[PDB]
């Protein structure tokens, strides 16, 4: 069960042409990047297994990003019109598209969605035959797209090419992509007073990002301060859960950790 | 516009002369392609533009062929010092990358040895046989377009000033008048069949029209005969009651 | 490296009979597209297939994409005269900027003649021509190797308002001898 996604962002900067940014992911691994603000804008690798691609790959992708950027400039002009916004405002057009594959490597689902100024705009439905428009401006886009039979056009990449590239990347990156890193776990103790302490359960250097951390007191779930999962910076992730406890009762508390990389769930205690 | 535009539609070139073919893609289309299609054959890729950038020139057959698209809209395909082998339909297409791939109608280029070989058609209409009328109660008019070169014609029928399609078949292929010669002139036939009664109405006017595509305003002509420019040649008949 | 081939080169089929054209690619394709080119026109897109083994039906046309994505077919059930023209396929391979077109199959639809009435008529110039007409579609008209014996090949005209079709060929330079190089019905009328 794997996935590929491209995320595009165009941002208008009246007085300063729009900026275009692309990132690509396979699962939780960013692999490619493009930034129109760069010294000499080009697609660049961001994961080891993509570095083997020849110059033709980089050149082609670079030219795609440049052409997309120009279309987005035009799309931004249309959107400004649809919403009767003035020529002073900075605005944001976002695109996310790609494919999901099941364990058999076959297409599970395609994705193709857009947002204007942080809010849903238009999205291709799961059937890959119809659109959902978020408002009446989006319906202008919707009608034009229906007239052009846009969803049928999108099927070629979403159902074909997308899955082929995902499969190439899975094979080139087998080591890192098909294998999970289990969390390095441990529990820390932090006195608040002579009467109260924090127990914190750490999960460090795991991949992928999906993880479960729960605290139990005498086996009873304590639903805990839970932080949002954060990047370690080396393509692994980190997260922690903490519970405040009366001093001397630490021994009653256990942290339960669940992760794809663990043969079995882990239970830890402050000792 | 809403469709791909190409000009000229037909071009006669003297061997060794340069030609320039123009293409105007669908409004807003990022992608532009040139293809070459020999008579009766399939399109073959020449070159591809993404906006102004010529990203794939791999199909261009020699240095004599070069394309430009300076403003990422209109494209010009230039063929230097034309040779006979360059005779083909040149198709322009525009797309949004993978999406919306659409062809124009093409430029039909014929490269000829000497412009003195170029001749407009003679056109004649042959009136239905009385025998056919009595035997079948139908009446077939025949149109002959003869003596033309090169094969740059469009035949149409006009009844009372209005183009007709029902009851018509024009030959798909011209005949060689001198099949032994490579400079051969051409001939083509068309049939328009109507009911006997319709033919028998003297108020009915039948015209066979042949649009020929020949030499241009810019071409030099030295020969004594009228310059064989693009022109229409027509022949006609009125219905007859007795 | 890559070749896109189409077979057969041409096909003459009787109105109401079926037509099939086959497209092969030597390399694996991402997707395949089919085009029709009406006589004297240019290729216009019919359909695209993406998935191995995919079958699409578009009116009387059935399109099929093979399991290895190297082969496709276009099938017409009950061909009509209006289906005449060249059918072209085109392959797309990911990574390139190119549509690669097959060599094409030309479809010629022979009309079904309800009431054969083979005849040769003479027509006179408005300012001399012979019309062989109303023969069965099984007739082939031949060209003579004479300096000035011009014979056109047969075409089918359709009197739409009368729901009537007819074959005919034209010869010019006597009508009795004009079509002597052809095998014409024994009962051909020479008025």
């Amino acid at each position: 069960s794997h996935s590929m996604r491209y995320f595009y962002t165009s941002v208008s900067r009246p007085g300063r042409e729009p900026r275009f940014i692309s990132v690509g992911y396979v699962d939780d691994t960013q692999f490619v990047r493009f930034d129109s603000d760069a010294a000499s804008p080009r697609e660049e690798p961001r994961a080891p297994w993509i570095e083997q691609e020849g110059p033709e790959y980089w050149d082609r992708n670079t030219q795609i990003y440049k052409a997309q950027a120009q279309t987005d400039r035009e799309s931004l002009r249309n959107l400004r019109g649809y919403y009767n916004q003035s020529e002073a405002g900075s605005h944001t057009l976002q695109s996310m598209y790609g494919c999901d594959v099941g364990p058999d490597g076959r297409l599970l689902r395609g994705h193709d969605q857009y947002a204007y100024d942080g809010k849903d705009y238009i999205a291709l439905n799961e059937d890959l035959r119809s659109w959902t428009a978020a408002d009446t401006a989006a319906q202008i886009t919707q009608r034009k797209w229906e007239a052009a039979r846009e969803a049928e056009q999108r099927r070629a990449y979403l159902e074909g090419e997308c899955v082929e590239w995902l499969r190439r990347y899975l094979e080139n990156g087998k080591d890192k992509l098909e294998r999970a890193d289990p969390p390095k776990t441990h529990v820390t103790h932090h006195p608040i007073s002579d009467h109260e302490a924090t127990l914190r359960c750490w999960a460090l250097g795991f991949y992928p990002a999906e993880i479960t951390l729960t605290w139990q007191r005498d086996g009873e779930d304590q639903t805990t301060e839970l932080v949002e999962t954060r990047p370690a910076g080396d393509r692994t992730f980190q997260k922690w859960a903490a519970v405040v406890v009366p001093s001397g009762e630490e021994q009653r508390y256990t942290c339960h950790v669940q992760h794809e990389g663990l043969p079995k769930p882990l239970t830890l205690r402050w000792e | 516009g809403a469709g791909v535009s190409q000009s000229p539609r037909y071009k006669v070139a003297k061997r060794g002369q340069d030609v320039a073919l123009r293409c105007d893609p669908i409004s807003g289309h990022v992608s532009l392609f040139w293809y070459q299609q020999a008579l009766g054959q399939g399109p073959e890729f020449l070159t591809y533009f993404q906006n102004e950038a010529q990203l794939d020139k791999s199909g261009l057959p020699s240095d004599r062929f070069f394309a430009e698209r300076p403003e990422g809209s209109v494209s010009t395909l230039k063929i230097q010092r034309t040779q006979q082998e360059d005779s083909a339909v040149y198709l322009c297409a525009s797309s949004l990358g993978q999406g919306h791939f659409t062809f124009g109608s093409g430029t039909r280029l014929t490269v000829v040895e000497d412009l003195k070989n170029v001749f407009p058609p003679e056109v004649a209409v042959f009136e239905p046989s009385e025998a056919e009328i009595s035997h079948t109660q139908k009446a077939t008019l025949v149109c002959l377009a003869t003596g033309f070169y090169p094969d740059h014609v469009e035949l149409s029928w006009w009844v009372n000033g209005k183009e007709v399609h029902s009851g018509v078949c024009t030959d798909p292929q011209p005949l060689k008048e001198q099949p032994a010669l490579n400079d051969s002139r051409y001939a083509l036939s068309s049939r328009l069949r109507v009911s006997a009664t319709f033919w028998q109405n003297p108020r009915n006017h039948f015209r066979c029209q042949v649009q020929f595509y020949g030499l241009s305003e810019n071409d030099e002509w030295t020969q004594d005969r009228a310059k064989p420019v693009t022109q229409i040649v027509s022949a006609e008949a009125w219905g007859r009651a007795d | 490296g890559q070749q896109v081939m189409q077979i057969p080169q041409y096909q003459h089929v009787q109105e109401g009979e079926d037509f099939t054209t086959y497209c092969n690619s030597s390399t694996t394709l991402s997707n395949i597209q089919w085009y029709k080119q009406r006589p004297g026109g240019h290729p216009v897109f019919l359909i695209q297939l993406v998935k191995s083994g995919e079958v699409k039906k578009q009116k009387r046309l059935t399109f099929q994409f093979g399991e290895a994505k190297k082969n496709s077919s276009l099938h017409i059930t009950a061909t009509q005269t209006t289906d005449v023209g060249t059918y072209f396929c085109a392959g797309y391979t990911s990574g390139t900027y190119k549509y690669i077109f097959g060599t094409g199959t030309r479809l010629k639809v022979l009309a079904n003649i309800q009431n054969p009435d083979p005849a040769v008529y003479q027509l006179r110039d408005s300012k001399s021509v012979c019309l062989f007409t109303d023969f069965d579609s099984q007739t082939n008209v031949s060209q003579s190797k004479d300096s000035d014996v011009y014979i056109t090949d047969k075409c089918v005209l359709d009197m739409r308002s009368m729901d009537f079709k007819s074959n005919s060929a034209v010869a010019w330079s006597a009508c009795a001898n004009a079509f002597n190089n052809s095998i014409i019905p024994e009962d051909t009328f020479f008025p």
Binding site: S22, S75, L79, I122, E150, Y157 | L96, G97, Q98 | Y97
Partner: peptide, 9 residues
Amino acid sequence: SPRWYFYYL
């Protein structure tokens, strides 16, 4: 690879 395909909202 990104999709070779362009559009306009």
